[PDB]
Amino acid sequence: GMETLELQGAKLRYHQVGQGPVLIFIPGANGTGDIFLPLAEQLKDHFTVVAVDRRDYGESELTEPLPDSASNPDSDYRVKRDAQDIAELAKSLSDEPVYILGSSSGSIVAMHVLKDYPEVVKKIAFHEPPINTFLPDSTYWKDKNDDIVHQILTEGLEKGMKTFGETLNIAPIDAKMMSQPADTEEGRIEQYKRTMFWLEFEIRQYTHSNITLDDFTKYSDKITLLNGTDSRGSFPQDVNFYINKETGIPIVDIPGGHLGYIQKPEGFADVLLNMWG
- Residues from 194 through 253 that contact Mg ion (CB under 5 A): 210, 238
Q: Which residue in 7, 17, 173, 272 binds a second copy (CB under 8 A)? A: 272
Q: Tell me the C-alpha distance between 58 and 52, whole Å.
A: 9
Across 19-170, the runs of DSSP E, i.e. the strands, are: 22-26, 48-53, 61-62, 98-103, 121-127
Nearer to Mg ion, 1 or 73 (CB): 73
| Interface positions, 101-120, toward a second copy (CB under 8 A) | 101, 103-105, 108-109, 111-112, 114-115, 118
Which residue stretch of 73-81, 103-111, 192-200, 242-250 sits at the interface with Mg ion (rule: CB under 5 A)? 73-81
Q: Is residue 13 within 8 Å of 53, Cβ to Cβ?
A: yes
Smallest CA-to-CA distance from 17 within 54, 43, 53 is with 43
Out of Mg ion, a second copy, none, which partner does residue 207 contact, by CB within 5 to 8 A per kind?
Answer: a second copy
Q: Which residue in 64, 73, 95, 233 binds a second copy (CB under 8 A)? A: 73
Q: Tell me the C-alpha distance between 268 and 262, whole Å.
A: 9
Q: Which residue in 39, 117, 169, 173 binds a second copy (CB under 8 A)? A: 39
- CB 213 → a second copy: shortest distance, Å? 5
Q: Tell me the C-alpha distance between 187 and 250, whole Å.
A: 39
Q: Which residue in 1, 64, 183, 205 binds a second copy (CB under 8 A)? A: 205
Those residues whose C-beta lies under 8 Å from the C-beta of residue 64, and which sit 6 or more positions away, are 9
Please, what is the angle between helix 185-198 and helix 156-167, to 10°?
60
Q: Does 182 bind a second copy (CB under 8 A)?
A: no
Out of Mg ion, a second copy, none, which partner does residue 172 contact, by CB within 5 to 8 A per kind?
Answer: none
Q: Does 255 bind a second copy (CB under 8 A)?
A: no
